[PDB]
Design a protein around this ligand. Structure first.
Ligand code: NA
Length: 121
């Protein structure tokens, strides 16, 4: 059907907006602390602490499969990256502090994305 292709035109265009948003969030992490999953060989207890790991490469694979049906789903994943990191690492660490900064800088980008997704549809 034609409707399915119009929805697909919108899921596709959402993906195009989310890709720009992802690239912009990932520029606020020049250290690349959040680029790839935490290594279970280097952190073998990780899953005893964090039940849903997330990272930017994993978000990108989902994005490129058109796996985000709305901005809420995308934001949930971004907040995992931040939230996992602030739980696992102590407050006085470079990692915990990188997450705070990412969150703060990410907020501005996400605020305007919520407007563009509402505005365009
Ligand atoms: Na903690």
């Amino acid at each position: 059907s034609m409707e399915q292709v119009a929805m697909e035109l919108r899921l596709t265009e959402l993906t195009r907006l989310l890709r720009s948003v992802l690239d912009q969030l990932q520029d606020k992490d020049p250290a690349r602390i959040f680029a790839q999953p935490v290594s279970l060989k280097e952190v073998p207890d990780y899953l005893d602490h964090i039940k849903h790991p997330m990272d930017f490469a994993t978000m990108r694979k989902r994005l490129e499969a058109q796996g985000y049906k709305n901005l809420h789903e995308f934001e949930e994943d971004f907040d995992l990256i931040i939230d996992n990191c602030m739980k696992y690492n102590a407050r006085d660490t470079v990692f915990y502090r990188a997450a705070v900064r990412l969150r703060d800088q990410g907020g501005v980008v996400l605020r305007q994305a919520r407007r563009e997704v509402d505005s365009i549809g």
